[PDB]
Amino acid sequence: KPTLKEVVIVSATRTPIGSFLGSLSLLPATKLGSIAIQGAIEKAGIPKEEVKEAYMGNVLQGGEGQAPTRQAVLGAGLPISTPCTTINKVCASGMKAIMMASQSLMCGHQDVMVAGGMESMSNVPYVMNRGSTPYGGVKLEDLIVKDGLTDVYNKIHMGSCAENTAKKLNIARNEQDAYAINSYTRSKAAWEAGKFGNEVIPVTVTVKGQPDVVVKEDEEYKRVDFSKVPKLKTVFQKENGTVTAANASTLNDGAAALVLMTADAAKRLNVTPLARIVAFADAAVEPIDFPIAPVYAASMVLKDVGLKKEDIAMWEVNEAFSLVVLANIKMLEIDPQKVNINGGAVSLGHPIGMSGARIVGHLTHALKQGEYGLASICNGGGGASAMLIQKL
Amino acid sequence: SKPTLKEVVIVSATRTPIGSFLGSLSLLPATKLGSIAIQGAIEKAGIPKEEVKEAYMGNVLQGGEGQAPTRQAVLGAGLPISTPCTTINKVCASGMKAIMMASQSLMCGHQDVMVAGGMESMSNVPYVMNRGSTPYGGVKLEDLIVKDGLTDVYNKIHMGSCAENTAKKLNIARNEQDAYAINSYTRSKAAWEAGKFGNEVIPVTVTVKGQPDVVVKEDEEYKRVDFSKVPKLKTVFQKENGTVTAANASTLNDGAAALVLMTADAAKRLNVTPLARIVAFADAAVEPIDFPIAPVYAASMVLKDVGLKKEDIAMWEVNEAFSLVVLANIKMLEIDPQKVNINGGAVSLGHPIGMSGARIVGHLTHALKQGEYGLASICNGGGGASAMLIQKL
Amino acid sequence: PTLKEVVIVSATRTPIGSFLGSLSLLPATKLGSIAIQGAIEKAGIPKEEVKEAYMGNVLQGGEGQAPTRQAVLGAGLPISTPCTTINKVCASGMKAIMMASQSLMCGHQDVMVAGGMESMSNVPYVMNRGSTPYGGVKLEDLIVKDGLTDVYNKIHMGSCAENTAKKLNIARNEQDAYAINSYTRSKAAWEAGKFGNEVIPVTVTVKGQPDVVVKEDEEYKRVDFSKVPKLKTVFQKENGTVTAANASTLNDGAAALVLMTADAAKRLNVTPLARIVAFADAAVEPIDFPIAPVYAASMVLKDVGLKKEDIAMWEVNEAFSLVVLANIKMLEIDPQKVNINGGAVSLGHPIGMSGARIVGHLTHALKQGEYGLASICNGGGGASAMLIQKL
Amino acid sequence: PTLKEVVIVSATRTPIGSFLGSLSLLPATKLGSIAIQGAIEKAGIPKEEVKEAYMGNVLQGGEGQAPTRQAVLGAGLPISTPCTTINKVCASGMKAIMMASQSLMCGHQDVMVAGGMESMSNVPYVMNRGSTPYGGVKLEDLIVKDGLTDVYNKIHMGSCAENTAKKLNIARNEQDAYAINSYTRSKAAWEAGKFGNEVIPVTVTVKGQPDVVVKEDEEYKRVDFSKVPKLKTVFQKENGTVTAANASTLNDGAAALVLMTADAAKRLNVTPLARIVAFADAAVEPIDFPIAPVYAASMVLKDVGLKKEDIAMWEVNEAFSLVVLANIKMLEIDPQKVNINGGAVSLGHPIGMSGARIVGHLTHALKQGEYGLASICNGGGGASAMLIQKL
Ligand SMILES: [Cl-]
Ligand SMILES: [Cl-]
Ligand SMILES: [Cl-]
Ligand SMILES: [Cl-]
Ligand SMILES: [K+]
Ligand SMILES: [K+]
Ligand SMILES: [K+]
Ligand SMILES: [K+]
């Protein structure tokens, strides 16, 4: 069995998450990426020159220009000698980036890296095929819908795949609506309690001839009306539906970044690590059955390390849909009071390439010394990633 | 202290033919070419499809391909639904970077068998229109090949225009570039007529309803040349004192490559004969405009890491993004030209950008003799390069 | 003053090209210049004698500012020539001649050019001004949107024809027989050289290519009679009657006439071809456009006290085979006197041009003393008609 | 038969809305229906008496089949009403009234509606038919391509205007003073209730929100006199004079007039507002469009045998402040008689409508027996002019 370098997280920072066409919509994903990368190096207390390589998750790259990760990195003022790779595992991209960076560090191939995710759904373009215009016209397709939200094999929206799981596991509209209100409640309380003080950095939006706007908290959690929640119409299934706009995640803009290093490099640089990356895994199922893939990924991680579900102090199961979280709670049989305790994607929003990084960053700050955190995240195609960390 | 890692071997390397832009393979999406190459490689390796645990594919222009390009390629090759997939974008270096990242996973003992490679259908890359309000006076529809593929962000100019900068700096003139180009076409033709791609390339059946089937069995781009016209062509990337032409630059193309990678232990367990050993690899980056020299630094890093000398390398694959790039690498490293790009390269064979990094590694795997060392390097937009060293078993 | 008598001095046209075919490289305005220059030449007058110009042109999007001004200046007419572009859909080319005649009748001008032009090959697609809707953006075809869709009923012109086929009991086999007869007559007239004075050749010039001379209508050769009764009914899948073969096609072309008062014709000593006797517009319920030409033609006959039997030649624009059969059925006229040298089903239908072409064709084909009546339906339920007498 | 006398019985218009402003949810044809129905109600005649309709409309792309027919049927006029859409660029609304007057004069109809309509807010973008070129393409704005760019010089109308500014020595400060004058006259006319009989209100209804009643022109309030001299000369960088403030703006609106023969007005017991005396078109070098209205007006005066002093009020369309000043200078007329209640620079310029608006304004503002002269330049180097006398 290989003898590997130990991998630690020294910082984890993110921009606030902006609403679709909302507060951060004038900023390209690469600029949000630059902001999170700069913030994370500042918080790590290290020279920018120490960062050897960068990986960033980013699902909808069309129209962002050549090499998005290179743009974010050079935009953050890191050396032109820094190699860059952009990662796409759909909704899992931000986590898979951290995983792959960890593997490089484990091998001794680099001693310090930046890893995370970025997405500007506000700036995702429409496409027109190459070739000749057909008589009678054409619809130009929305890349959010075509590349981001539509299952290739079933030719249906992610939300309609979720209805499939709602059926099999008997997870009703009222249960999903209750989970959703719970998420919005938890997000608000966390923000009010100042729980994001270290994690989130403000972004100043500048427009020539107009006043500056400082965006210092997540935009999405205030965009709800609890009285309307149970009256909303089910968009992805008109007949016997359970998923709505309120209980599903939303379209958003944001970036997150982590400074990762070997335990050795943390010592050399006289920095105090926050958590240790212990294990991680990918699992896959039938594409339509993506909501349950995180069950299997999580069990793999637990089994690999020889821990039991009860050993986990804090769970982050990405809230792609309220259904997804409930499906995981049911199948794993874990205590819901330990799941997504400070809100999640249903109320905070889902910039798809960054969510995987955000949830790992959140565990890092929220866990108490010695406690174990497990983050898992489903993705388009029938996949999931999961990661176990231990607070230091 | 250095970690103790698993040994990684190449068990098979397989590719589609490379088709010209809007040419013989243009009806097929990148993901389908991926599925063909992936199935090719599995079959050639003689293992059951269920043995492959995970897949990484390079793919630069993913717009309009649909959700999860790599997952599409993998499921379309009939691999299990249990197989995790990730799509890699290091621009021109993507196909090699996929192999490198897969290798690191194997080294860590996180997987025992994986497929890695690259795929690109430049014929099928779309145009984009921005979200929002239509601006008075007009709306632009940008070409994603130009916008995401070939334009340097920082300098706001084409790759070939950046290339002119290195041509200038190292005094590499039009004639040498043209000579290299003709050399590339010559080698390609020779190799194809000699049957040197007999175990490397698998043929493609193109089916159209009503139409007779087309069987594409060889690379398309190398026949598209006229040596007498080469010196006459205009330098399309710079008005004053140009050297880069369509003839001596790589072309836009479609194709896919896939490699089956495993640990030494897994190759024993499955009773397969490994082709090559993956020894070392590196990434380097310089000023974005200076991308032609990045492979020099990456190659040096690899040699220095393994403690080998340039003279120890039996065969070099320096990606022929531009004739210029190969010449500059030959110059700075002072290696023997007769050992470089022996059976052609991207100037004559084509450059489906996400595929090329995987192709050249796959080529060394088949070309090297028992015990020989091969080094492959590749520049990428933004100022980067990847390099890989292998040894034939 | 008293109303002036109006004469046709010349009438000229380009060949009609197929959709994306022989003339597709030329904009409508350029075809217009070609027709206008040819008509002035045939008239035997200086370009400076032309006082004002009206051209029909339905699909003007993307043609640039003032299409008729472009056609006129492109033909080398004086910068002092006022220009107006006319849109009465399919009736545009005839309506331009009617309005110009009215100006001449008033003594407001003495010599004018009038006609029509269309390049359906070059009609663009449109995108709405505003915010791109989530989920996709629709690019509509102006041919379909402005040219061929009825506003009120939300159906294609071909579906309106199906509606008349139902009401008047005009079957598929009857429409197919008419169409084959149109193709047959077009070919016979070309072979007999009957367009030698009407049509002028067009030279298509491409940088680094050899010149191509287009000398004859393209559309009429594009047919297979054995396949006609097998074609799908595209506007109505169940129990349909209208097909691509028996409907008119999308096309490119221009036509132009030189019109004068009787006084100016005498002053300039030209030999007039025909006198303009009378003209009229009629309109009916939008879906019923195929029958509007019946009322328009009846109006002109009544106005001058002539009976249907007094007419030597009828030009009833062949928008669909259905339209001509409906007109013959309602008017009870001799089919052997209708569209004798083919029409739009086999020659094509550049919509803004056809109304002018059919008037011009009568001017060449009628024998001295004979009356010709031209009528043409238009989208929205309209029709125009004109009666001329050969001099 | 002798020429018939033509009278204006009513003249009505919508408010003019700003680009993407108060009326931007309404299609041009809907504004046309509103103005047409208003004009007929004001005339006090049965709607069935209206025999035919012509409407000016420059930017017809994407409005659907037969825009005039849509306006007409949408106003509830009979389906027996023939319809034609007129395009003489900026002159279209006047040219429609002129052409309709010619039909009446000939005795071809006894009652017509004529006017103009434009919704610049709803003008689309175009993409060429064919295969997309490697490297991408710019979808063109039809307002720019078809409305405002001179074909021959390949520059904006605003840049063509600079040529005349240079030639006649009309400086920036003088153009700015004229512009401020127009805004001032517009406000004062609105405050004095001068449009009470001319303008009808429009109610804009949206599902799930309250009605908005648009009762006055929107444009003249969008100004700050202190900023007028600080604006950039956007049509010519060096030695420029034309700005966004001293040029007309992009707007939405429609206007319609009811026209009759004197005999028809007698038969229907209608008291007409004004008599149409004479009209003319002139044309010069396309770049020199601002001076064409001088020649068109002189033609009309010379035709009728009036001197400039005989004219009580002038409407010279304010396409640019530059145009009005060039006209005042060349004709040597009292500026206090010119565009008395504002004009296009401050009220806006829905291009197909303005030529009709200015004739309708004279019809209301003139005192009994007084002569008014309206003139309007158009892209391509044209102008139309019309003389009326108040009854
Ligand atoms: Cl996956
Ligand atoms: Cl890089
Ligand atoms: Cl009509
Ligand atoms: Cl004109
Ligand atoms: K929600
Ligand atoms: K080449
Ligand atoms: K046909
Ligand atoms: K203004």
**CB neighbour list of residue B63: distance below 8 Å, 6 or more residues apart:** A61, A62, A63, A127, A143, A147, B125, B126, B128, B144, B148
Name the resolution in angstroms: 2.0
CA distance C362 to C375: 11
Helix axes A29-44, A68-75, angle to 10 degrees: 50
Is residue D345 a known part of a binding site?
Answer: yes
Going by C-alpha positions, the residue among A361, A10, C25 that lies closest to residue D129 is C25
Domain match, B216 and B290 both = no
Give chain D's domain count: 2
Q: Which residue carries 């529809």 as its tokens?
A: B141
Sign of CA dihedral D142, D145, D146, D147: positive
- The span from the CA of B22 to the CA of B220, in Å, is 11
Look at residues A29, A152, A77 and name the one whose alpha carbon lies nearest to residue B148.
Answer: A29
Hunting for tokens 């990426």 — which residue is that?
A: A33
Measure CA of the first residue to CA of the last residue in chain A; give whole Å: 25
Question: Are the CB atoms for B254 and B206 separated by under 8 Å?
Answer: no
| Cβ count near A389 (within 10 Å) | 26
Do A185 and A292 share a domain, yes or no?
yes
Tell how far CA A217 is from the center of its chain.
17
Tokens describing residue A164: 């499939």
Structure tokens at D219: 């444009």
Residue in D closest to A132 by C-alpha: D131
Of C86, C85, C92, C90, nearest to C150 by C-alpha is: C90
Q: Which two tokens stand for residue A379?
A: 């993705």
Looking at residue D317, which CATH number applies to its domain? 3.40.47.10
Q: How far is B76 from chain D (nearest CA, A)?
A: 30
Judging contacts by C-beta atoms under 8 Å, the chain A residues touching residue C141 are 135-137
Rounded distance between C-alpha atoms, residue B392 and residue A227, angstroms: 69
A353 closest CA partner among A315, A321, A379, A382: A379
Q: Please say which residue of B247, B278, B309 terminates a domain.
A: B278
Q: What value does the CA radius of gyration of chain A take, rounded to a whole number of Å?
A: 20
Under 8 Å between Cβ of B391 and B374 = yes
Question: In this structure, are residues B34 and B113 in contact, taking their beta carbons and an 8 Å threshold?
Answer: no
Q: Show which of D243, D276, D309 is a domain's final residue.
A: D276
C vs D: CB pairs below 8 A: 213
Residue A299, domain extent: 153-194+278-389
For residue C140, which residues of chain D lie inside 8 Å, CB to CB?
Answer: 62
Rounded to a whole number of angstroms, the CA Rg of chain D reads 20
**Backbone angle region of D239, left / alpha / beta, with phi > 0 → left and psi within -120 to 50 → alpha:** left
Catalytic residue among C83, C90, C106, C160: C90
- Three-state DSSP at C125 gives strand
Residue D212, both tokens = 């908005």
Quick check: helix, strand or coil at residue C257? Answer: strand
Residue D143 lies in a domain: no
Would you list the DSSP string of D13-73?
Answer: EPPPEETTSTTTTS-HHHHHHHHHHHHHHHHTS-GGG--EEEEE-S--TTS-S-HHHHHHH
Q: Please tell me whether A297 is known to bind a ligand.
A: no
Separation of alpha carbons B187 and B222, rounded Å: 10
- Which pair of tokens denotes residue A362? 């959140």
Residues of the binding site of C = 183, 222-224, 227, 244-245, 247-248, 345
Tokens of D139: 């979808």
| DSSP letter for each residue of C315-382 | EE--SBHHHHHHHHHHHT--GGGBSTT--HHHH---HHHHHHHHHHHHHHHSPTT-EEEEEEEETTTE
Hey, are the CB atoms on A145 and C132 less than 8 Å from each other?
A: no
Chain C nearest CA to D30, separation (Å): 13
Is A304 contained in some domain? Answer: yes
> How far apart, in whole angstroms, are the C-alpha atoms of residue D64 and residue A119?
40
Cα(D348)–Cα(D119) distance, integer angstroms:
12
Return the structure tokens found at B93: 């270096």
In degrees, to the nearest 5, what angle opens at C-alpha A258 toward C-alphas A252 and A263?
160
Answer for the pair A87, A58: CB distance below 8 angstroms, yes or no. Answer: yes
**SS3 assignment, position C19:** coil
Instruction: Using the 3D structure, point to which of B278, B293, B327 is the last residue of a domain.
Output: B278
CA distances (Å), origin A191, targets A196, A338, B343, C346:
6, 18, 62, 75
**Chains in contact with chain B (at least 3 beta-carbon pairs closer than 8 A):** A, C, D
Q: Are residues A346 and A373 in the same domain?
A: yes
Question: Of C127, C132, C137, which to mutate for an interface test with B (greatest number of B Cβ within 10 Å)?
Answer: C132
Three-state secondary structure along chain A?
CCECCCEEEEEEEECCCEECCCCCCCCCHHHHHHHHHHHHHHHHCCCHHHCCEEEEECCCCCCCCCCHHHHHHHHCCCCCCCCEEEEEECECHHHHHHHHHHHHHHCCCCCEEEEEEEEEHHHCCEEECCCECCCCEEEEEEHHHHHHHEECCCCEEHHHHHHHHHHHCCCCHHHHHHHHHHHHHHHHHHHHCCCCCCCECCEEECCCCCCCEEECCCCHHHCCCCCCHHHCCCCCCCCCCCCCCCCECCCEEEEEEEEEEEHHHHHHCCCCCCEEEEEEEEEECCHHHHHHHHHHHHHHHHHHHCCCHHHEEEEEECCCEHHHHHHHHHHHCCCHHHECCCCCHHHHCCCCCCHHHHHHHHHHHHCCCCCEEEEEEEECCCEEEEEEEEEC
Give the environment of ion ligand 7: residues with CB less than 5 A. C 245, 345
What DSSP element (H or E) covers D189?
A: helix D172-191
Q: Which residues 6+ apart lie within 8 Å of D238 measured at CB?
A: none
- Domain presence at residue B141: no
**Does any domain span residue A131?**
no
Q: How far apart are the CA of D84 and the centre of ligand 3, in A? A: 7
Question: Exposed, middle or buried by CB within 10 Å (0-12, 13-18, 19+), for D210?
Answer: exposed
- CB-based contact B134 C132, cutoff 8 Å: yes
Cα–Cα dist A373/A303, whole Å: 15
HEC string of chain B equals CCCECCCEEEEEEEECCCEECCCCCCCCCHHHHHHHHHHHHHHHHCCCHHHCCEEEEECCCCCCCCCCHHHHHHHCCCCCCCCCEEEEEECECHHHHHHHHHHHHHHCCCCCEEEEEEEEEHHHCCEEECCCECCCCCEEEEEHHHHHHHEECCCCEEHHHHHHHHHHHCCCCHHHHHHHHHHHHHHHHHHHHHCCCCCCECCEEECCCCCCCEEECCCCHHHCCCCCCCCCCCCCCCCCCCCCCCCCECCCEEEEEEEEEEEHHHHHHHCCCCCEEEEEEEEEECCHHHCCCHHHHHHHHHHHHHCCCHHHCCEEEECCCEHHHHHHHHHHHCCCHHHECECECHHHHCCCCCCHHHHHHHHHHHHCCCCCEEEEEEEECCCEEEEEEEEEC
C249 & C361 share domain: no
Structural domain includes residue A137: no
Closest CA to D244 of B136, B132, A211, B139: B136
User: A132, D130: Cβ pair inside 8 Å?
Assistant: yes
D223 is in an annotated binding site: yes
**Tokens matching residue A81:** 């000698």
Q: State how far the Cα of B75 lies from the Cα of B115, in Å rounded to an integer.
A: 13
Mutate to test the interface with D, among A127, A128, A129 (most CBs of D within 10 A): A128
User: Given the DSSP bridges, would you call strands D6-13 and D251-261 parallel, antiparallel or unpaired?
Assistant: antiparallel
* Distance (Å) of CA B153 to CA A75, B345, D122: 11, 27, 36
Radius of gyration over alpha carbons of chain B, in Å?
Answer: 20
Residue C339 token pair: 């569209």
Residue A81 Cα, ligand 2 centroid: separation in angstroms?
8
Distance of CA B92 to the CA centre of its chain: 7
Q: By a Cβ cutoff of 8 Å, what residues of chain D touch chain B?
A: 125, 127, 132, 134-141, 143-144
Instruction: For residues B27 and B23, give the distance between their C-alpha atoms in angstroms, rounded to a whole number.
Output: 8
H or E segment at C113? strand C111-119
Following DSSP, what letter does each residue of D310-338 receive, concatenated?
GEEEEEE--SBHHHHHHHHHHHT--GGGB
Same domain, yes or no: B64 and B173:
no
**Are the C-beta atoms of A321 and A173 separated by less than 8 Å?**
no
- Cα–Cα distances (Å) from A113 to A266, B102, B125, C262, in that order, read 12, 18, 32, 93
Residues A218 and A115 reside in one and the same domain: yes
Residues of chain B with Cβ-Cβ distance to A293 below 8 Å are none
Q: If you measure from the C-alpha of residue D165 to the centroid of ligand 3, how many angstroms do you get, rounded to a whole number? A: 43
d(CA B159, CA B291): 9
* Residue located via tokens 């000698």: A81
Task: Kindly state the tokens that stand for B250.
Answer: 């790589």
B246 annotated ligand binder: yes
With beta carbons less than 8 A apart as the criterion, state whether C319 and C175 touch. no
CA dist., res. C332 & res. D264, Å (int): 36
Which amino acid type is present at position C289? F
CA C208, C212, C218, C223 torsion: positive or negative? negative
Q: Can you name the residues that pair with C127 across neighbouring β-strands?
A: D125
- Does residue A132 lie in a domain region? no
C142 Cβ neighbours under 8 A, 6+ residues apart: C59, C61, C123, C124, C125, C126, D61, D62
Residues around ion ligand 5, judged by CB within 5 A, are A 250
Taking CB atoms and an 8 Å cutoff, what residues of chain D touch A131?
A: 131-132
Looking only at the bridges linking them, the beta strands covering D52-56 and D111-119 are parallel
Give the number of other Cβ atoms within 10 Å of residue B379's Cβ.
31
* Breaks in chain D, after residue numbers (C to N greater than 2.5 Å): none
D-chain residues near C107 (CB < 8 A): 3
Q: What is the biggest distance separating any 2 CA atoms in chain A, rounded to whole angstroms?
A: 67
Query: How many whole angstroms separate alpha carbon B74 and alpha carbon B55?
Result: 7
Q: Give residue ranges of B with CB < 8 Å to any C CB.
A: 129-134, 139
Rounded Cα distance between B97 and B115, Å, is 13
Check whether residue A204 and residue A182 sit in a common domain: no
Please indicate, yes or no, whether residues B190 and B257 belong to a single structural domain of this protein: no
What is the rounded CA–CA span in Å between residue A294 and residue C144? 50
Q: From ligand 1's centre to the CA of D139, what distance in Å?
A: 39
Tell me the Cα Rg of chain C. 20
What's the rounded Cα separation, in Å, for the pair B126 and A278? 42
Size of interface A-B (CB pairs under 8 A): 214
Please name which of A105, A110, A116, A117 lies closest in space to residue A276, comparing C-alpha atoms: A105
Strand ranges (DSSP E) for chain D? 6-13, 17-18, 52-56, 83-87, 111-119, 125-127, 137-141, 149-150, 155-156, 202-204, 212-214, 251-261, 274-283, 311-316, 371-378, 382-390
Across the interface, whether the CB atoms of A152 and B68 are under 8 A apart is answered yes
Chain centre to alpha carbon of residue D281: 15
- Which residue is it, tokens 């005094």? B171
Chain D partners (3+ C-beta pairs within 8 A): A, B, C
Q: How far is D307 from chain C (nearest CA, A)?
A: 21
Give the nearest partner residue to A138 out of C139, C143, C144, using CB atoms.
C139
Rounded distance from Cα D345 to ligand 8 centre (Å): 5
- Structure-token pair, residue B98: 């996929």
Tokens read off for C335: 């089919």
Distance separating alpha carbons of residues A221 and A215, to the nearest angstrom: 14
CA–CA dist B340, D178 (Å, integer):
76
The torsion of the CA quartet D305, D310, D312, D316, rounded to 10 degrees, works out to: 50
- In DSSP terms, which residues pair with C126 in a beta bridge? C140, D126
Active site residue A378: yes
Q: How far is Cα D317 from Cα D295, in angstroms, rounded to an integer?
A: 14
Residue type for position D231:
L
Residue with tokens 């199935």: B39
Residues of D in contact with C85 (CB under 8 A): 86-88
Considering the domain architecture, whether residues C211 and C307 belong to the same structural domain is answered as no
Q: Which residue in B6, B72, B84 is closest to A383 by CB distance?
A: B84
CA dist list (Å): D355 to C92, D259, D281, D345:
22, 15, 13, 14
Residue D131 DSSP class:
B
Strands B113-121 and B54-58: parallel
Please list the residues that pair with C257 across neighbouring strands: C11, C114
CA B239 and chain centroid, separation: 30
Neighbours of chain C (3+ CB pairs under 8 A): A, B, D
A78 in the same domain as A15:
yes
| 3-state percent helix, strand, coil for chain D, nearest multiple of 5 | 40, 25, 35
Structure tokens belonging to residue B204: 């493609």
Residue A181 lies in a domain: yes
| CA of B346, nearest ligand number | 6
Distances (CA, A) of A374 to A118, A325, B20: 22, 14, 48
How many angstroms separate the alpha carbon of residue D247 from the centre of ligand 8? 5
Q: Which of C51, C57, C59, C87 to mutate to test the interface with D (most CBs of D within 10 A)?
A: C87
Contact D138 B138 (CB under 8 A): yes
Contact present, D77 and D53 (Cβ < 8 Å): yes
Give burial (CB, 10 Å; 0-12/13-18/19+) of A329: buried
Question: What is the dihedral angle through the alpha carbons of C349, C353, C355, C360, rounded to the nearest 10 degrees?
Answer: -110
CA distance A261 to A106: 9
Same domain, C211 and C233: yes
* Sign of the alpha-carbon torsion through C167, C169, C172, C177: negative
Query: Partners of C283 in the beta sheet?
Result: C382
Write the CB contacts of C121 (distance below 8 Å, at least 6 apart in sequence): C17, C19, C20, C21, C23, C24, C252, D129
Cβ–Cβ of C84/D87 closer than 8 Å? yes
Residue C287 DSSP symbol: G
* Closest Cα in chain A to D126: A137
Q: Tell me whether residue B379 is one of the annotated catalytic residues.
A: yes
CB contact under 8 A, A130 and B147: no
- C-alpha dist (Å) from residue C262 to C3, C104, D34: 11, 10, 43
Cβ(D16)–Cβ(D218) below 8 Å: yes
Say yes or no: C30 and C108 in one domain. Answer: yes
Residue B131 has its nearest CB partner, among C129, C130, C132, at C132
Question: Which residues, in sequence order, are bridge partners of residue A323?
Answer: none
How far, in Å, is the centroid of ligand 2 from the Cα of B288? 9
What number of H helices and E strands is found in chain C? Answer: 11, 16
Greatest CA separation for chain C: 67
Residue of A nearest to C148 (CA): A136
Tell me the pairing of strands C371-378 and C311-316: parallel
Contact between chains at D139 and B138 (C-beta distance less than 8 A): yes
- On the 0-12 / 13-18 / 19+ scale of CB atoms within 10 A, A48 is middle
**Has B178 been labeled as part of a binding site?**
no
State whether D142 and C102 contact (CB < 8 Å). no
Sign of the CA dihedral with B77 first, then B81, B84, and B86 last = positive
Task: Give domain status of residue C132, yes or no.
Answer: no
Nearest alpha-carbon partner for C215 in C201, C229, C232: C201
